Short mmCIF file of C-alpha atoms and ligand atoms in Angstrom, two decimals:
data_model
loop_
_atom_site.label_atom_id
_atom_site.label_comp_id
_atom_site.label_asym_id
_atom_site.label_seq_id
_atom_site.Cartn_x
_atom_site.Cartn_y
_atom_site.Cartn_z
CA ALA F 287 111.31 25.97 -17.85
CA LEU F 288 109.03 22.93 -17.24
CA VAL F 289 111.34 19.80 -17.87
CA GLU F 290 110.89 16.39 -16.19
CA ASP F 291 113.77 17.15 -13.82
CA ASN F 292 116.60 19.71 -13.30
CA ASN F 293 119.57 17.14 -13.86
CA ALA F 294 122.03 20.03 -13.87
CA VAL F 295 119.85 23.21 -14.28
CA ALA F 296 119.48 26.12 -11.79
CA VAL F 297 117.35 25.13 -8.79
CA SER F 298 117.67 27.43 -5.73
CA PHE F 299 116.27 25.57 -2.66
CA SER F 300 116.98 27.77 0.10
CA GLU F 301 118.18 27.04 3.57
CA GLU F 302 114.88 28.38 4.63
CA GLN F 303 112.92 26.10 2.16
CA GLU F 304 114.58 23.15 3.66
CA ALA F 305 114.03 24.41 7.19
CA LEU F 306 110.22 24.20 6.72
CA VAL F 307 110.27 20.59 5.34
CA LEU F 308 112.48 19.35 8.25
CA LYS F 309 110.71 21.05 11.09
CA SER F 310 107.34 19.99 10.02
CA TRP F 311 108.42 16.46 9.36
CA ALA F 312 109.71 16.40 12.89
CA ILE F 313 106.18 17.18 14.17
CA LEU F 314 104.62 14.45 12.16
CA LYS F 315 107.55 12.21 13.21
CA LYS F 316 106.26 12.13 16.81
CA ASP F 317 102.71 11.03 15.78
CA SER F 318 104.02 8.77 12.87
CA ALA F 319 101.75 5.81 13.53
CA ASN F 320 98.62 7.88 13.37
CA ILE F 321 99.30 10.33 10.59
CA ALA F 322 100.36 7.47 8.24
CA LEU F 323 96.86 6.01 8.74
CA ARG F 324 95.20 9.37 7.99
CA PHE F 325 97.67 9.85 5.00
CA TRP F 326 96.73 6.53 3.47
CA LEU F 327 93.01 6.82 4.23
CA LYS F 328 93.22 10.22 2.31
CA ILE F 329 94.71 8.42 -0.71
CA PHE F 330 92.28 5.60 -0.41
CA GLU F 331 89.68 8.30 -0.32
CA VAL F 332 90.81 10.13 -3.58
CA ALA F 333 91.81 7.10 -5.52
CA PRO F 334 90.71 3.89 -3.68
CA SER F 335 92.12 1.84 -6.61
CA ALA F 336 95.58 3.15 -5.77
CA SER F 337 95.30 1.13 -2.61
CA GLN F 338 94.92 -2.03 -4.65
CA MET F 339 98.71 -2.02 -5.41
CA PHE F 340 99.34 -3.36 -1.93
CA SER F 341 96.63 -6.01 -0.76
CA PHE F 342 93.26 -6.33 1.19
CA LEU F 343 93.21 -5.79 5.13
CA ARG F 344 95.05 -8.63 7.34
CA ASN F 345 97.33 -8.07 10.53
CA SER F 346 95.86 -7.23 14.14
CA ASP F 347 92.19 -8.23 13.18
CA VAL F 348 90.14 -5.29 11.59
CA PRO F 349 89.24 -3.95 7.95
CA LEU F 350 91.09 -0.78 9.19
CA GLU F 351 94.08 -2.07 7.30
CA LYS F 352 96.95 -1.97 9.98
CA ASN F 353 99.29 -3.94 7.48
CA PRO F 354 103.10 -3.14 7.71
CA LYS F 355 104.04 -2.74 3.88
CA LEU F 356 102.09 0.49 3.99
CA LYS F 357 103.27 2.04 7.26
CA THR F 358 106.75 1.40 5.93
CA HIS F 359 106.11 2.73 2.46
CA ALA F 360 104.31 5.88 4.06
CA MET F 361 107.55 6.52 5.81
CA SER F 362 109.54 6.09 2.58
CA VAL F 363 107.59 8.86 0.78
CA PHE F 364 108.03 11.18 3.78
CA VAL F 365 111.60 10.24 4.76
CA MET F 366 112.75 9.97 1.12
CA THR F 367 111.22 13.46 0.46
CA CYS F 368 112.94 15.12 3.32
CA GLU F 369 116.21 13.57 1.95
CA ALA F 370 115.30 15.19 -1.39
CA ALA F 371 114.79 18.66 -0.02
CA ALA F 372 117.98 18.19 1.96
CA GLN F 373 119.71 17.32 -1.32
CA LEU F 374 118.28 20.08 -3.39
CA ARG F 375 119.68 22.75 -1.16
CA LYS F 376 123.36 21.44 -1.14
CA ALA F 377 123.75 20.15 -4.74
CA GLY F 378 120.67 21.77 -6.50
CA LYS F 379 119.44 18.33 -7.70
CA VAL F 380 118.24 14.84 -6.64
CA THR F 381 121.34 12.55 -6.46
CA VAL F 382 120.05 9.37 -4.84
CA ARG F 383 122.37 6.29 -5.21
CA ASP F 384 122.10 4.32 -8.57
CA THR F 385 121.02 0.98 -6.79
CA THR F 386 118.30 2.72 -4.87
CA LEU F 387 116.92 4.74 -7.77
CA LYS F 388 117.35 1.73 -10.24
CA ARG F 389 115.57 -0.25 -7.67
CA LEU F 390 112.59 2.21 -7.28
CA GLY F 391 112.23 2.53 -11.04
CA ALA F 392 111.55 -1.23 -11.53
CA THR F 393 109.34 -1.51 -8.46
CA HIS F 394 107.16 1.31 -9.62
CA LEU F 395 107.09 0.16 -13.19
CA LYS F 396 106.21 -3.46 -12.20
CA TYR F 397 103.24 -2.25 -10.10
CA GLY F 398 101.79 0.04 -12.73
CA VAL F 399 102.36 3.21 -10.75
CA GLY F 400 101.57 5.93 -13.24
CA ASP F 401 101.73 9.71 -13.39
CA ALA F 402 98.22 9.97 -11.72
CA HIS F 403 99.35 7.88 -8.71
CA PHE F 404 102.33 10.17 -7.98
CA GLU F 405 100.14 13.17 -7.88
CA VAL F 406 97.34 11.79 -5.66
CA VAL F 407 100.10 10.85 -3.15
CA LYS F 408 101.55 14.35 -3.25
CA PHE F 409 98.04 15.65 -2.79
CA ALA F 410 97.60 13.57 0.20
CA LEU F 411 101.10 14.20 1.40
CA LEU F 412 100.58 17.97 1.36
CA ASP F 413 97.12 17.63 2.78
CA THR F 414 98.29 15.54 5.75
CA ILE F 415 101.04 17.99 6.62
CA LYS F 416 98.53 20.97 6.25
CA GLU F 417 96.21 19.11 8.41
CA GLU F 418 98.66 17.89 11.05
CA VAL F 419 100.90 20.92 11.45
CA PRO F 420 99.73 23.96 13.34
CA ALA F 421 97.91 26.45 11.01
CA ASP F 422 100.65 28.88 12.12
CA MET F 423 103.78 27.04 10.72
CA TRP F 424 101.90 26.17 7.51
CA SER F 425 102.00 28.52 4.67
CA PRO F 426 102.16 28.36 0.82
CA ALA F 427 105.99 28.65 1.15
CA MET F 428 105.94 25.27 2.99
CA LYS F 429 103.68 23.48 0.39
CA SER F 430 106.08 24.40 -2.39
CA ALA F 431 109.10 23.20 -0.37
CA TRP F 432 107.65 19.76 -0.08
CA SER F 433 106.30 20.08 -3.66
CA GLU F 434 109.67 20.85 -5.01
CA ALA F 435 111.22 18.03 -3.06
CA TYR F 436 108.61 15.43 -4.08
CA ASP F 437 108.59 16.79 -7.61
CA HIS F 438 112.31 16.24 -8.13
CA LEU F 439 112.14 12.79 -6.33
CA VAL F 440 109.47 11.49 -8.63
CA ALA F 441 111.30 12.76 -11.63
CA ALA F 442 114.57 10.75 -10.82
CA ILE F 443 112.40 7.61 -10.32
CA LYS F 444 110.30 8.18 -13.51
CA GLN F 445 113.47 8.31 -15.60
CA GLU F 446 114.28 4.91 -14.10
CA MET F 447 110.94 3.67 -15.67
CA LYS F 448 111.76 4.25 -19.34
CA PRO F 449 114.91 3.38 -21.42
CA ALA F 450 118.04 5.27 -21.99
CA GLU F 451 118.39 9.11 -22.34
CA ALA H 76 77.70 -1.88 -6.74
CA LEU H 77 77.96 -5.55 -5.90
CA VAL H 78 75.55 -7.76 -3.90
CA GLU H 79 75.50 -10.58 -6.57
CA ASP H 80 76.58 -8.69 -9.92
CA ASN H 81 76.77 -10.47 -13.31
CA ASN H 82 74.53 -8.93 -16.27
CA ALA H 83 71.60 -7.47 -14.15
CA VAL H 84 73.49 -5.05 -11.81
CA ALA H 85 71.26 -4.61 -8.62
CA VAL H 86 70.70 -0.99 -9.16
CA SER H 87 68.75 0.23 -6.24
CA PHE H 88 68.38 3.98 -6.65
CA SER H 89 65.54 5.64 -4.67
CA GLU H 90 63.43 8.68 -5.69
CA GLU H 91 64.81 10.42 -2.66
CA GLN H 92 68.33 9.83 -3.98
CA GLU H 93 67.36 11.40 -7.36
CA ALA H 94 65.71 14.13 -5.35
CA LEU H 95 68.96 14.98 -3.62
CA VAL H 96 70.86 15.09 -6.95
CA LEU H 97 68.39 17.41 -8.57
CA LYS H 98 67.98 19.84 -5.76
CA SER H 99 71.76 20.27 -5.40
CA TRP H 100 71.96 20.58 -9.21
CA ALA H 101 69.56 23.63 -9.19
CA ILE H 102 71.92 25.47 -6.94
CA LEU H 103 74.98 24.77 -9.24
CA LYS H 104 73.04 26.14 -12.14
CA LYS H 105 72.59 29.61 -10.52
CA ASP H 106 76.39 30.00 -11.06
CA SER H 107 77.59 27.37 -13.67
CA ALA H 108 80.50 29.36 -15.08
CA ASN H 109 82.40 29.93 -11.87
CA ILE H 110 81.57 26.50 -10.35
CA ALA H 111 82.75 24.74 -13.58
CA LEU H 112 85.84 26.71 -13.08
CA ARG H 113 86.37 25.54 -9.43
CA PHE H 114 85.77 21.77 -10.61
CA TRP H 115 88.64 21.60 -13.17
CA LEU H 116 90.93 23.45 -10.84
CA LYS H 117 90.22 20.86 -8.12
CA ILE H 118 91.20 18.11 -10.54
CA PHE H 119 94.32 19.96 -11.83
CA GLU H 120 95.32 20.43 -8.13
CA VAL H 121 94.86 16.64 -7.45
CA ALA H 122 96.02 15.42 -10.86
CA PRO H 123 97.95 17.92 -13.07
CA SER H 124 98.47 15.20 -15.69
CA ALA H 125 94.70 15.06 -16.10
CA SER H 126 94.09 18.53 -17.53
CA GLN H 127 97.28 18.11 -19.52
CA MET H 128 95.11 15.50 -21.77
CA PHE H 129 93.08 18.53 -23.14
CA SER H 130 96.47 20.31 -23.69
CA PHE H 131 96.73 23.22 -25.98
CA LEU H 132 97.51 24.06 -29.77
CA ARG H 133 94.41 24.15 -32.01
CA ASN H 134 92.71 26.79 -29.71
CA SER H 135 96.32 28.31 -28.74
CA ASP H 136 94.53 28.95 -25.36
CA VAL H 137 97.44 28.29 -22.91
CA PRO H 138 95.61 29.32 -19.59
CA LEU H 139 92.80 27.15 -18.20
CA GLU H 140 89.69 29.52 -18.17
CA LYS H 141 90.68 30.09 -21.81
CA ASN H 142 89.97 26.66 -23.39
CA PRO H 143 86.22 25.84 -23.97
CA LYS H 144 87.18 22.17 -23.88
CA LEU H 145 87.06 22.15 -20.02
CA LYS H 146 84.01 24.28 -19.31
CA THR H 147 82.05 22.04 -21.69
CA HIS H 148 83.46 18.84 -20.24
CA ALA H 149 82.71 20.08 -16.59
CA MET H 150 79.18 20.48 -17.84
CA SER H 151 78.63 17.05 -19.31
CA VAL H 152 80.22 15.16 -16.39
CA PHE H 153 77.62 16.95 -14.16
CA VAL H 154 74.80 16.80 -16.61
CA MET H 155 75.36 13.24 -17.66
CA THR H 156 75.88 12.16 -14.05
CA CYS H 157 72.60 13.74 -13.19
CA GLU H 158 70.99 11.85 -16.02
CA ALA H 159 72.21 8.44 -14.74
CA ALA H 160 70.53 9.31 -11.48
CA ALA H 161 67.24 9.70 -13.33
CA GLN H 162 67.82 6.46 -15.32
CA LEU H 163 68.89 4.32 -12.37
CA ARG H 164 65.89 5.48 -10.57
CA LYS H 165 63.37 5.09 -13.41
CA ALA H 166 65.01 1.88 -14.95
CA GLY H 167 67.51 0.43 -12.61
CA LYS H 168 70.22 0.87 -15.20
CA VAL H 169 72.14 3.64 -16.96
CA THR H 170 70.10 3.80 -20.25
CA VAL H 171 72.48 5.92 -22.26
CA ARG H 172 71.90 5.18 -26.01
CA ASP H 173 74.30 2.32 -26.85
CA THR H 174 75.97 4.54 -29.61
CA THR H 175 76.92 7.37 -27.10
CA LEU H 176 78.32 4.87 -24.60
CA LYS H 177 80.45 3.34 -27.32
CA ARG H 178 81.71 6.76 -28.44
CA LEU H 179 82.48 7.60 -24.77
CA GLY H 180 84.56 4.56 -24.21
CA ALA H 181 86.39 4.88 -27.53
CA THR H 182 87.19 8.56 -26.43
CA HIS H 183 88.45 7.90 -22.99
CA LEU H 184 90.31 4.80 -23.83
CA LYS H 185 92.01 6.86 -26.60
CA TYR H 186 93.06 9.42 -24.00
CA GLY H 187 94.58 7.36 -21.32
CA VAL H 188 91.81 7.72 -18.73
CA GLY H 189 92.09 4.91 -16.03
CA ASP H 190 90.44 4.30 -12.71
CA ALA H 191 92.51 6.92 -10.98
CA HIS H 192 91.28 9.80 -13.22
CA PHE H 193 87.61 8.58 -12.84
CA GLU H 194 87.93 8.50 -9.17
CA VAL H 195 89.85 11.82 -8.86
CA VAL H 196 86.99 13.44 -10.89
CA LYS H 197 84.55 12.00 -8.60
CA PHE H 198 86.41 13.22 -5.51
CA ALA H 199 86.36 16.72 -7.07
CA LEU H 200 82.85 16.36 -8.17
CA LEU H 201 81.85 15.63 -4.59
CA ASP H 202 84.12 18.44 -3.12
CA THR H 203 82.61 20.88 -5.67
CA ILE H 204 79.10 20.02 -4.74
CA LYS H 205 79.90 20.05 -0.99
CA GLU H 206 81.39 23.47 -1.42
CA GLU H 207 78.40 24.97 -3.56
CA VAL H 208 75.24 23.66 -1.62
CA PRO H 209 74.24 25.05 1.80
CA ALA H 210 75.88 23.22 4.72
CA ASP H 211 72.39 22.35 5.75
CA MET H 212 71.38 20.70 2.52
CA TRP H 213 74.49 18.56 2.27
CA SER H 214 74.11 15.23 4.02
CA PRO H 215 76.11 12.11 3.64
CA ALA H 216 73.05 10.81 1.67
CA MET H 217 73.31 13.72 -0.84
CA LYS H 218 77.02 12.80 -1.12
CA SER H 219 75.90 9.28 -1.48
CA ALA H 220 73.34 9.86 -4.23
CA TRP H 221 75.98 11.59 -6.34
CA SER H 222 78.65 8.88 -5.82
CA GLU H 223 76.08 6.22 -7.02
CA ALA H 224 75.03 7.93 -10.23
CA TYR H 225 78.69 8.63 -11.17
CA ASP H 226 79.92 5.14 -10.28
CA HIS H 227 77.39 3.38 -12.37
CA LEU H 228 77.73 5.84 -15.27
CA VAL H 229 81.43 5.19 -15.22
CA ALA H 230 80.84 1.36 -15.12
CA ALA H 231 78.79 1.88 -18.40
CA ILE H 232 81.52 3.82 -20.26
CA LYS H 233 84.09 1.16 -18.88
CA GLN H 234 82.32 -1.66 -20.50
CA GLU H 235 82.99 -0.03 -23.82
CA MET H 236 86.70 0.51 -22.94
CA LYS H 237 87.30 -3.28 -22.68
CA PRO H 238 86.81 -6.23 -24.88
CA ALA H 239 83.38 -8.02 -25.25
CA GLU H 240 84.36 -10.64 -22.84
C1 LIG M 88 108.17 9.55 -5.09
C2 LIG M 88 107.44 8.94 -3.99
C3 LIG M 88 107.54 7.60 -3.55
C4 LIG M 88 108.62 7.04 -2.96
C5 LIG M 88 109.82 7.80 -2.50
C6 LIG M 88 108.42 5.61 -2.92
C7 LIG M 88 109.27 4.68 -2.33
C8 LIG M 88 109.08 3.31 -2.35
C9 LIG M 88 110.00 2.40 -1.82
C10 LIG M 88 111.32 2.79 -1.14
C11 LIG M 88 109.52 1.16 -2.01
C12 LIG M 88 110.18 -0.17 -1.56
C13 LIG M 88 110.16 -1.54 -2.38
C14 LIG M 88 111.41 -1.93 -3.13
O1 LIG M 88 112.28 -1.08 -2.99
O2 LIG M 88 111.49 -2.95 -3.86
C15 LIG M 88 108.24 1.33 -2.66
C16 LIG M 88 107.32 0.30 -3.00
C17 LIG M 88 106.09 0.47 -3.64
N1 LIG M 88 105.49 1.60 -4.01
FE1 LIG M 88 106.30 3.45 -3.76
N2 LIG M 88 107.20 5.34 -3.52
C18 LIG M 88 106.65 6.54 -3.92
C19 LIG M 88 105.43 6.74 -4.53
C20 LIG M 88 104.57 5.74 -4.83
C21 LIG M 88 103.33 5.98 -5.44
C22 LIG M 88 102.74 7.29 -5.84
C23 LIG M 88 102.73 4.76 -5.58
C24 LIG M 88 101.35 4.54 -5.94
C25 LIG M 88 100.21 5.00 -5.10
C26 LIG M 88 103.62 3.76 -5.02
C27 LIG M 88 103.41 2.38 -4.98
C28 LIG M 88 104.32 1.38 -4.51
C29 LIG M 88 104.15 -0.08 -4.49
C30 LIG M 88 102.99 -0.96 -4.94
C31 LIG M 88 105.22 -0.63 -3.94
C32 LIG M 88 105.45 -2.11 -3.66
C33 LIG M 88 105.21 -2.53 -2.21
C34 LIG M 88 104.60 -4.01 -1.95
O3 LIG M 88 103.72 -4.50 -2.75
O4 LIG M 88 104.89 -4.71 -0.82
N3 LIG M 88 104.69 4.38 -4.61
N4 LIG M 88 108.03 2.62 -2.86
C1 LIG M 89 81.66 9.64 -16.33
C2 LIG M 89 82.30 10.97 -16.22
C3 LIG M 89 82.57 11.67 -17.44
C4 LIG M 89 81.74 12.04 -18.45
C5 LIG M 89 80.24 11.93 -18.29
C6 LIG M 89 82.51 12.44 -19.64
C7 LIG M 89 82.02 12.80 -20.84
C8 LIG M 89 82.87 13.06 -21.99
C9 LIG M 89 82.38 13.50 -23.25
C10 LIG M 89 80.85 13.50 -23.55
C11 LIG M 89 83.42 13.85 -24.04
C12 LIG M 89 83.43 14.39 -25.48
C13 LIG M 89 83.79 13.53 -26.76
C14 LIG M 89 82.64 12.67 -27.18
O1 LIG M 89 82.35 11.76 -26.34
O2 LIG M 89 82.06 12.97 -28.26
C15 LIG M 89 84.55 13.64 -23.22
C16 LIG M 89 85.85 13.96 -23.62
C17 LIG M 89 87.00 13.71 -22.84
N1 LIG M 89 87.10 13.29 -21.64
FE1 LIG M 89 85.48 12.72 -20.49
N2 LIG M 89 83.82 12.29 -19.30
C18 LIG M 89 83.88 11.80 -18.05
C19 LIG M 89 85.05 11.55 -17.32
C20 LIG M 89 86.39 11.79 -17.79
C21 LIG M 89 87.51 11.59 -16.93
C22 LIG M 89 87.37 11.06 -15.52
C23 LIG M 89 88.61 11.95 -17.69
C24 LIG M 89 90.02 12.11 -17.26
C25 LIG M 89 90.61 13.13 -16.50
C26 LIG M 89 88.08 12.38 -19.03
C27 LIG M 89 88.84 12.91 -20.04
C28 LIG M 89 88.36 13.31 -21.25
C29 LIG M 89 89.15 13.79 -22.33
C30 LIG M 89 90.62 14.01 -22.34
C31 LIG M 89 88.33 14.03 -23.35
C32 LIG M 89 88.49 14.56 -24.81
C33 LIG M 89 88.11 15.99 -25.09
C34 LIG M 89 87.86 16.25 -26.58
O3 LIG M 89 88.02 15.37 -27.36
O4 LIG M 89 87.43 17.29 -26.99
N3 LIG M 89 86.78 12.25 -18.99
N4 LIG M 89 84.18 13.15 -22.02
#
C-alpha cells in the first residue's frame, strides 16, 4: 500500500537494512562538522528559500553561515533517522516519545515546513551519504534503508501537524 | 535580481547570455521526448509531491511517461524560459502578454506551487541541461544565463499569485 505511515502494518526492516544506515552514519560521524556544511549547502542549493527558516549568516565572521542552530538541526535529521531505522527493525514502526513528536509537530507547523521541504532534505540527505561514503559501501539497498527510515520519521511528525485521527 | 529593485527591475541580460540559452536549446531539441522524460523524473526524485499535483484520473494514465500533462509542461517550462531570455535581452523585462501571465499565476496559485517547487524545477532544469549539452559547451555562464531567464520569468508569474499591493 501507499499510506502516510505504517502505524501497525507489516514493515520488514531487516537487520541488514539497519546495518547499512548505522555503519554509514558512523563514517559521516567522524567528519560531522564538514559534511553538515556540505549537506546544508546542498539544500541551500536545491531550495535556497528552505534556508530562510533559520536566519542570515552571523557567528565566526563569514557569509559561509557557520551558525549553530543548523549544525545541531543537521545532526537531528541524521541522528533522529538512525533512531528510526533502529526502531523499524525491532517494532516495525516509528514509536518516538509523545513529548518529542508533539514537540516536532508544532515546531514544523509553526515554521511552515511543508511536504516539499521534507523531500529536498531527504534528497540532500541521501546525496550527502552517497557522496561521503565510499562508492563501495553505497548501493541502492542503502538509499532505501535511509529512505524508509526518513519516510516513516516524517510521517509520525506530519500527523502531529494536523488534528485528530 | 536586486541592485535597487522597485518597478523597473535592472534587467541586464546580454546577447551572449541569450546566445548560450539558444545554442544549448538546439541540442535539447534533437531529442525532446527522452530529455523531457529525464526532467520530470529529476523533479519527482527531488520532490515526489510535485508530480503528484498532475495526479491521475481523467487520463487513467497511472505511470509517468503515460500522462501527456508532463511532457507538455516540460516543454513550456523550457520554451517559455527560453522566451524570457529573448525578452530580457531585447526589452529588459519579461514581456509575456499580461493575460497569459495572469492565467499562469491563477493556475499555479490554484495548485499549491510555492518557492520550493519553483526552485526545485530550476535545479532540475539546470541538471537536465548540464547533462544534455557537451561538457565543453557547458560553462558556469551557460548555467548562469538559464538561471536568469527562469528567475525573472518566475518573478513575473509570482506577481500574479499575490495581491496588487
Ligand atoms: C524528519 C526530519 C527532520 C527532523 C528529524 C527534524 C528535527 C528537528 C528538531 C529536533 C528540531 C528542534 C526544535 C524544537 O524541538 O523546538 C527542529 C527544528 C526545526 N526544523 Fe526540523 N527536522 C526535520 C526536517 C526538517 C525539514 C525538512 C525542515 C525544512 C527544511 C525543517 C525545519 C526546521 C526549523 C525551522 C526548525 C526550527 C529551528 C530554529 O529556528 O532555531 N526541519 N527540527
Ligand atoms: C516558470 C516555470 C514554469 C512555466 C513556464 C510553467 C508553465 C505552465 C503552463 C503554461 C501551464 C498550463 C495551464 C495554463 O497556464 O493554461 C502550467 C500548468 C501547471 N503547472 Fe506550471 N509552469 C512553470 C513552473 C511550475 C512549477 C515550478 C510547478 C510545480 C511543481 C508547476 C505546476 C503546474 C501544475 C500542477 C500545472 C497544471 C497542469 C494542468 O492544468 O493541466 N508549474 N504551467
